[PDB]
Amino acid sequence: ALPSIQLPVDYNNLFNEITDFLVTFKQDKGPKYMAMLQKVANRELNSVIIDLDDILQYQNEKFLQGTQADDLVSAIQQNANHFTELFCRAIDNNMPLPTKEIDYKDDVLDVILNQRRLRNERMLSDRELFPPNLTRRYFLYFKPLSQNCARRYRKKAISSKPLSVRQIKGDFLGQLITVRGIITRVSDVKPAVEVIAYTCDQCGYEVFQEVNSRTFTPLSECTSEECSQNQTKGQLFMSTRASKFSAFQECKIQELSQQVPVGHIPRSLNIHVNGTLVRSLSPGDIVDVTGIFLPAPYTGFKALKAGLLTETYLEAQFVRQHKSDVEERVMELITSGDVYNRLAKSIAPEIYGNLDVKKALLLLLVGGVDKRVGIRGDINVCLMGDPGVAKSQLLKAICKISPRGVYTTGKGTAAVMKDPVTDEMILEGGALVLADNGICCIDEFDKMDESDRTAIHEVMEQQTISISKAGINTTLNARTSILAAANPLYGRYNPRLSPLDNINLPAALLSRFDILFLMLDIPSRDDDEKLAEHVTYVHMHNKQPDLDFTPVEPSKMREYIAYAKTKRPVMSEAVNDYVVQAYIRLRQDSKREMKFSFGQATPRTLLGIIRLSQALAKLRLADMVDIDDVEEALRLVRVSKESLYQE
Amino acid sequence: IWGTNVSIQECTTNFRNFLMSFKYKFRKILDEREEFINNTTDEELYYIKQLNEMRELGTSNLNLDARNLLAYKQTEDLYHQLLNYPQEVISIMDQTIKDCMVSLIVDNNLDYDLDEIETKFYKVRPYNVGSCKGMRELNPNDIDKLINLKGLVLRSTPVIPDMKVAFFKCNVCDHTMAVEIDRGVIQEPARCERIDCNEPNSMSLIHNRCSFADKQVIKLQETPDFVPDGQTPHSISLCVYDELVDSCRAGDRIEVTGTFRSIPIRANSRQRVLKSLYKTYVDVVHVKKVSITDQDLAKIREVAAREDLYSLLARSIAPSIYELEDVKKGILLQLFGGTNKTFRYRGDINILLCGDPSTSKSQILQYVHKITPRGVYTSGKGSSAVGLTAYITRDVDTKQLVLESGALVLSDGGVCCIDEFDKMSDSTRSVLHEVMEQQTISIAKAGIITTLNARSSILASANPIGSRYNPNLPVTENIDLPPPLLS
DNA sequence: TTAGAGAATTGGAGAGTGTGTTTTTTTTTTTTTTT
DNA sequence: CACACACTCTCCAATTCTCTAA
Numbered sequence A: 001a002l003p004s005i006q007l008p009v010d011y012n013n014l015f016n017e018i019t020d021f022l023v024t025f026k027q028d029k030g031p032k033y034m035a036m037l038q039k040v041a042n043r044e045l046n047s048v049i050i051d052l053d054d055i056l057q058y059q060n061e062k063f064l065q066g067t068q069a070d071d072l073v074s075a076i077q078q079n080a081n082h083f084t085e086l087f088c089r090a091i092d093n094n095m096p097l098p099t100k101e102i103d104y105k106d107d108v109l110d111v112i113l114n115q116r117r118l119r120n121e122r123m124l125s126d127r128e129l130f131p132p133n134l135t136r137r138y139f140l141y142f143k144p145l146s147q148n149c150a151r152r153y154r155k156k157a158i159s160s161k162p163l164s165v166r167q168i169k170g171d172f173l174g175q176l177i178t179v180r181g182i183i184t185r186v187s188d189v190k191p192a193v194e195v196i197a198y199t200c201d202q203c204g205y206e207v208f209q210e211v212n213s214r215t216f217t218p219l220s221e222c223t224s225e226e227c228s229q230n231q232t233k234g235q236l237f238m239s240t241r242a243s244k245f246s247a248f249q250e251c252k253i254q255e256l257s258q259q260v261p262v263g264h265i266p267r268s269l270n271i272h273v274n275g276t277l278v279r280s281l282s283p284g285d286i287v288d289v290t291g292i293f294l295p296a297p298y299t300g301f302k303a304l305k306a307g308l309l310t311e312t313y314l315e316a317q318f319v320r321q322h323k324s325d326v327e328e329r330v331m332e333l334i335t336s337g338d339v340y341n342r343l344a345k346s347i348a349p350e351i352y353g354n355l356d357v358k359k360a361l362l363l364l365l366v367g368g369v370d371k372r373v374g375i376r377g378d379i380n381v382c383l384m385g386d387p388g389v390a391k392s393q394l395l396k397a398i399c400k401i402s403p404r405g406v407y408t409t410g411k412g413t414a415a416v417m418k419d420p421v422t423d424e425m426i427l428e429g430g431a432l433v434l435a436d437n438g439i440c441c442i443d444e445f446d447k448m449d450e451s452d453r454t455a456i457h458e459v460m461e462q463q464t465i466s467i468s469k470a471g472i473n474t475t476l477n478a479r480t481s482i483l484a485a486a487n488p489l490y491g492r493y494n495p496r497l498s499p500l501d502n503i504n505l506p507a508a509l510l511s512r513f514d515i516l517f518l519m520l521d522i523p524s525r526d527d528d529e530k531l532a533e534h535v536t537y538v539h540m541h542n543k544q545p546d547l548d549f550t551p552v553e554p555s556k557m558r559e560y561i562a563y564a565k566t567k568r569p570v571m572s573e574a575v576n577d578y579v580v581q582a583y584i585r586l587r588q589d590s591k592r593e594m595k596f597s598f599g600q601a602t603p604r605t606l607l608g609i610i611r612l613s614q615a616l617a618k619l620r621l622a623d624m625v626d627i628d629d630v631e632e633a634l635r636l637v638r639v640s641k642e643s644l645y646q647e
Numbered sequence B: 001i002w003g004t005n006v007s008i009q010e011c012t013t014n015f016r017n018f019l020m021s022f023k024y025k026f027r028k029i030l031d032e033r034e035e036f037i038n039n040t041t042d043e044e045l046y047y048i049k050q051l052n053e054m055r056e057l058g059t060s061n062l063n064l065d066a067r068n069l070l071a072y073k074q075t076e077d078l079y080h081q082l083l084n085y086p087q088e089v090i091s092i093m094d095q096t097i098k099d100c101m102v103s104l105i106v107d108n109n110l111d112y113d114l115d116e117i118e119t120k121f122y123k124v125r126p127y128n129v130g131s132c133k134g135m136r137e138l139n140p141n142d143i144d145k146l147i148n149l150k151g152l153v154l155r156s157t158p159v160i161p162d163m164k165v166a167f168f169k170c171n172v173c174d175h176t177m178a179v180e181i182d183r184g185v186i187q188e189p190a191r192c193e194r195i196d197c198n199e200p201n202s203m204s205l206i207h208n209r210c211s212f213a214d215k216q217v218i219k220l221q222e223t224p225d226f227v228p229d230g231q232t233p234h235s236i237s238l239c240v241y242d243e244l245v246d247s248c249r250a251g252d253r254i255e256v257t258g259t260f261r262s263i264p265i266r267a268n269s270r271q272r273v274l275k276s277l278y279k280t281y282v283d284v285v286h287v288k289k290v291s292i293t294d295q296d297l298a299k300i301r302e303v304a305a306r307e308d309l310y311s312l313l314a315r316s317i318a319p320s321i322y323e324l325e326d327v328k329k330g331i332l333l334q335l336f337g338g339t340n341k342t343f344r345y346r347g348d349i350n351i352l353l354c355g356d357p358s359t360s361k362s363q364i365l366q367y368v369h370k371i372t373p374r375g376v377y378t379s380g381k382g383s384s385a386v387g388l389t390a391y392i393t394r395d396v397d398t399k400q401l402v403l404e405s406g407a408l409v410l411s412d413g414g415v416c417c418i419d420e421f422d423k424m425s426d427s428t429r430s431v432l433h434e435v436m437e438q439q440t441i442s443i444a445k446a447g448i449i450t451t452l453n454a455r456s457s458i459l460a461s462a463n464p465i466g467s468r469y470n471p472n473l474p475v476t477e478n479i480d481l482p483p484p485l486l487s
Numbered sequence C: 001t002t003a004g005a006g007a008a009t010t011g012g013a014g015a016g017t018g019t020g021t022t023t024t025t026t027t028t029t030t031t032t033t034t035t
Numbered sequence D: 001c002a003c004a005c006a007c008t009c010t011c012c013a014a015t016t017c018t019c020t021a022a
Ligand SMILES: Nc1ncnc2c1ncn2[C@@H]1O[C@H](COP(=O)(O)OP(=O)(O)OP(O)(O)=S)[C@@H](O)[C@H]1O
Pocket: A350, A351, A352, A353, A385, A386, A387, A388, A389, A390, A391, A392, A393, A487, A531, A535
């Protein structure tokens, strides 16, 4: 038998209080929630976000005038699933009639309403039928309590404290909690059925079946009164037209590396977003998901197979992300600060020296626009450098400021197919596709195998990576700007040896790079002293030794690229002339020098010069490409070439 | 129509009066087209002409457009119901098409077999139903609603036979009758239809004597130019019935119109327990590939009679590449090739493009690949797109020993433009030796011994060793290619 | 021969005995022949 | 383990039948 227990909650009084709250609450138009229900009746909104701050304010207001409440906020944070049904029932009771001419072109549910009502009425006079969830066209959610900063939050308001996946103990099941973590795997949207709309071949009667079990059994038996009394034994046919579906997405939230105790492994927690919250979560997110932590049961046969050990999921209710005024601000900064010399030092404030490398990194960050083909607007630079030089620090600084920027190493791109056996997903990405409209910081570029060599070669002159797993020949758009940080083999760079001999990169791949910098360290007497002072100051004060203008926000570069991308600075005819004689004399001096053959100016150097000039004008208003721009571009190109011949 | 409060009779009458007396001028004025002056192409009865074309060609499907329903006046509710109730609407449209065609045959006195027309099933293919809906924006209120989709097909399953008409046999009196199958349920007879036998439970299904239809599930993939740059493109499963089968091979890009439908899936095969996730597909009703002439003979004679034909063709081979006069000449001659003399003689031109690394060494390769009818562009060093040689693969799905042909074969008559010919492996270099010498590729692996006819044309382009080609040094010392392969 | 009182049999629901699942070959070592 | 399926064991009232009915 089932015993009985005494619990002081009194659901009926709570329901009366709930109805009073939905009727008699007006935030400091009429009532807020009545206005929301009016909008719902107009079919202009299908999300009743029941805030808990509002319920707390309602309780506080009625505390001074009768205390006509039973701590609802503390009564639904303990059991939220039942109160979702209570709120839905209270909304159906107080649902206002529409106050708008809503088109009813697709009124299948209304058609079923009136049809079944007429069929019942023609015999009711003898001359609930509809499930409560079937009629609802809204989804109800809970917004957790905000910060209290008062004695009310005396360790209470468990939905106020963002927990981690490890701290979600088993005794929180059924409560309305919130977790903080990084999404890792969000599934595709699937229509989860809430109530089926079986129709019988005879007897005319359709019987509905509410289901929340992840698995059900079709009725297929006309148990209707007419069918049973006539013993027709009719079978039932599903009608997806008259059924009710809710979009279902099954996310999965991990925990941040700062929440994991030492020696442990990050945990994970399944999230079941459904309703209007679908597609609000993506794998590259850090969120504070608020939901009801519920024990999904192993209903079926593995049920008896396992036992009391349940599996849990978080029925998400509210997702809070963490991650022309700006145009005026950046315009004013342009007027005040010299972008050319300021943004360069802003990229790597904690990295001393190598200013021209930073200037080239600005051009890569902006990049010219030459989408028209006959070509490409992606700037690629490689820093051959030297062991012990802060190439990796520069790469990380670029990654942390460049939108859609990723950092990766040669030895641990490409792509993998169908990683999980169960779901059997198709065409999982890699590292180059993630930085589609961004930059890939390929550290240890020399130590990167032939497969990735071919992959990056395809990406570099195709902007689209492809696979040939099972003859599908599918491709992934990866228009990523490439930033390489290869380092010389046999340790330190040898200036005497030829540059391509020092690093195991084929001349075919290196020659396609728009600009190349060889930036090696030399033991000096003053540069090292300033470097040591800088690093030690950073260690003391945890902040850079600020000695000049150091802008921080990257939105200025975003504004510049978005501004001049539509502008597309058109090159001048005199510019084209000066660059054709520039190529002529460059090739002439390349011959007369031939010392290292890693120079012969090539059509690709002209394309790189054009795109660098385009990027420079793209930074400075529109159509600024003139002699002034091309002189700086050619100066940068010549300096980069000379860098290969340093000392 | 159930659940709609819509009479089928009024819809049939609307579509009937829309069939004839309708002109393309209504469509021309619907979209506010300025060039509505045309008379023959606008004021003529477009659908009557289409029906006459079907009569004189004996076709079934109709490439009906959706906007033509908006152009006419009484078929606006019909268009909205088509978007909302595609199944019943399409069925009544097909019945109306058949009845209108037989009525036209009766009226115009164009003598024809009425039974032959009645037997043939006539279909309608409403395309351009609406805006190009996104795959990622398929919320579950679009169930049983007409949907337009764009994408590139990944693969296509073979023909899947689905039973349409059952066929039972009385195992005691050899009485056979056919039971129509509706919604995939077997309504087997309770007893023998013949009264002299009327034996219950004496019916056994004769599988091979039934009637089957064609179903071809197609795995559509979201087009790259519309997917968000972050996540990988999603996929949906098509369904193609009774026609349009093999009308879109893998790799094609199509604009598909169909009803977005969802069905339950059995959690356990033995039991009737159904998962509550309702896997979704779409029932295709029309596919459009978004992607020889006497006048042509006259054009051939005109271009052939030109004195400068040779130079003109040389220029047209690589219009965007300057100089390279003789290279284009050689490539042009390769495109034609010698006579295929038989009685083996190759009768083909093999061209290698050496020198220092050249962008044209690639640009002209893509140009000639686009020019040549057959053949395929392939990289010798990478061979990622095509393996460049025929080798046996286990296709994983069914784990079967499928033999997939390389790049050399499948390019008979065509030109197999190789790239990075210097960096290709030695194993495939031996295959190149075999194909250029023997003209066939022979395989002996996993119990399969066979010879594949290649008969291909080689147009390779190999970069040299070092920074650039050295003219003083011989070609062998610069290209890194065995002398027998170069000769 | 007709409208109506008597025997005689057996199919359609249900008591019950025994079934049938969930259930898995990834990833990681170790060997071996070619490369 | 237990819920659902397939099926042997088992059982009365509506359906058929032939002696006595009108
Ligand atoms: N110019 C610089 N300014 C500040 N710190 C620097 C500078 N150069 C080097 N460092 C320091 O050097 C370390 C990072 O150097 P790395 O970039 O790892 O050298 P590396 O050349 O990448 O070494 P590898 O692994 O052989 S490529 C950090 O401790 C930095 O603080």
